[PDB]
Amino acid sequence: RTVARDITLLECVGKGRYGEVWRGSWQGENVAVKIFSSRDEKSWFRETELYNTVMLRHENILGFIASDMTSRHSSTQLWLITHYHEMGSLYDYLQLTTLDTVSCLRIVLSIASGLAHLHIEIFGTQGKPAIAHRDLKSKNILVKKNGQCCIADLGLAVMHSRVGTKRYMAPEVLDETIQVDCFDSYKRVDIWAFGLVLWEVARRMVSNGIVEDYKPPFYDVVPNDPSFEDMRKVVCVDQQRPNIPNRWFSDPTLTSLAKLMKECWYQNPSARLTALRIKKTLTKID
Ligand SMILES: COc1cc(-c2cncc(-c3ccc(C4CCNCC4)cc3)c2C)cc(OC)c1OC
Ligand SMILES: COc1cc(-c2cncc(-c3ccc(C4CCNCC4)cc3)c2C)cc(OC)c1OC
Numbered sequence: 001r002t003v004a005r006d007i008t009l010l011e012c013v014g015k016g017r018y019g020e021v022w023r024g025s026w027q028g029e030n031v032a033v034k035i036f037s038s039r040d041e042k043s044w045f046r047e048t049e050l051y052n053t054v055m056l057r058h059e060n061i062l063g064f065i066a067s068d069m070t071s072r073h074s075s076t077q078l079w080l081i082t083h084y085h086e087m088g089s090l091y092d093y094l095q096l097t098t099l100d101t102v103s104c105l106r107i108v109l110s111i112a113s114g115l116a117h118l119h120i121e122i123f124g125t126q127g128k129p130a131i132a133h134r135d136l137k138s139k140n141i142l143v144k145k146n147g148q149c150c151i152a153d154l155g156l157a158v159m160h161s162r163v164g165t166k167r168y169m170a171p172e173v174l175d176e177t178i179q180v181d182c183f184d185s186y187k188r189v190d191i192w193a194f195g196l197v198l199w200e201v202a203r204r205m206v207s208n209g210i211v212e213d214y215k216p217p218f219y220d221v222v223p224n225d226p227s228f229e230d231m232r233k234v235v236c237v238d239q240q241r242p243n244i245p246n247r248w249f250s251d252p253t254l255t256s257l258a259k260l261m262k263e264c265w266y267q268n269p270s271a272r273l274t275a276l277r278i279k280k281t282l283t284k285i286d
C-alpha cells in the first residue's frame with residue numbers, strides 16, 4: 001500500500017526563535033507544520049515523548065497529526081504536524097476583534113476546559129497522566145471557527161503519574177521558591193498564567209459601549225522583552241497585579257471575571273483556584 005507523506009507547504013504563518021510554522025496541505029486538507037530550529041530541538045523531543053506516552057484527544061487541545069524526523073546530509077530536520085486553525089492565535093484575534101458576553105465566556109471556558117483536561121489524571125485504559133503545560137499564554141492558544149479555543153505547544157510540558165515566557169511567569173518561578181519536587185506546583189504556575197490570559201480577554205469584552213485596547217499583561221510596568229529581573233521586581237518585590245478598570249464593575253460578567261482573576265493571582269500558590277474550580281465558576285456566570 002501507498003503511504004502518502006508529501007506535505008505541500010503553502011504559507012509561513014509564524015517565525016521565531018523556535019523555527020517556523022507553515023500552513024500546509026496533505027491529501028487536500030489543511031495542516032499546520034512546525035519546523036523546529038536547532039535551538040529548540042528539545043521541545044520537539046518533549047512533545048513527541050508526551051504524545052508517545054498518551055495520545056491526547058480533546059476539543060480544547062491542539063490536535064496532533066504527526067512527528068517527523070528526517071535525516072539530512074549534515075543535519076536533522078524535525079517537524080510537528082497538527083490541525084490548522086485559520087483564525088490564528090488568541091493573541092492575533094484579540095488585536096482587532098472585540099467580544100460580547102457570550103463569546104468572551106465561550107473563549108475562557110474552553111481554555112479552562114483544555115487546561116483542566118491536561119491537569120487531571122485519568123485512571124484506567126482510556127486514561128492519561130496529569131500534565132502541566134508550563135508556557136500558557138495567548139500566543140499558545142488558537143481560536144476555532146466555532147468560537148472555542150484550543151491550547152497548543154507542549155514542548156515544555158511535564159507529566160505526573162527552554163523556560164517559560166517571562167512575562168507570564170508566576171512569582172514563585174521568578175523568586176526561585178517553587179517546590180520543584182511537587183507536581184502540584186507546576187499546575188499552580190499554569191493557573192497564574194491562566195489568570196493573565198483571562199485578563200487579556202476580558203479587556204476586549206464590550207460593556208456599556210466601552211472596551212479596552214488589546215495589551216499584554218504588565219504592559220504598563222515592564223518593557224518589551226522584559227528581563228527576568230524586571231519581572232521579579234514587579235511581580236515579587238512590589239507584588240503588582242494587572243489593573244482592573246472601573247467599568248468592569250458596572251457589568252455582572254466582568255465583575256465575576258475580575259474576582260476569578262484575583263483568585264488565580266495569589267502570591268501563595270496553594271491559595272489559587274484549581275482548573276476544575278475555575279470551570280465550575282465559569283459555568284455559573286450568566
Ligand atoms: C510515516 O510517515 C507518515 C505516514 C502517513 C500516513 C499516510 N498514509 C497512511 C498512513 C497509515 C496510517 C495507519 C495505517 C494502519 C494502522 C494499523 N493497521 C491498519 C492500517 C496505515 C497507514 C500513514 C500513517 C502520513 C504522514 O504525514 C501526514 C507521515 O509523515 C509524518
Ligand atoms: C496520521 O493522520 C492521518 C492518518 C490517516 C489514515 C490513513 N490511512 C489509514 C488510517 C487508519 C486506518 C485504520 C486504522 C485502524 C486501527 C485499529 N484497528 C482498525 C482500524 C488506523 C488508521 C488513517 C487514520 C488519515 C488522516 O486523515 C484522514 C490523517 O490525518 C491527517
Ligand SMILES: COc1cc(-c2cncc(-c3ccc(C4CCNCC4)cc3)c2C)cc(OC)c1OC
Binds near residue numbers: 032080087089139
Ligand atoms: C502555538 O503553537 C502552534 C500553533 C500552530 C498553529 C496552528 N494553526 C494555526 C496557526 C496560525 C495560523 C495563522 C496565524 C496568523 C496570524 C496573523 N495573521 C497571519 C497568520 C497564526 C497562527 C498556528 C500558529 C501550530 C503548531 O504546530 C504545528 C504549534 O506548535 C505546537
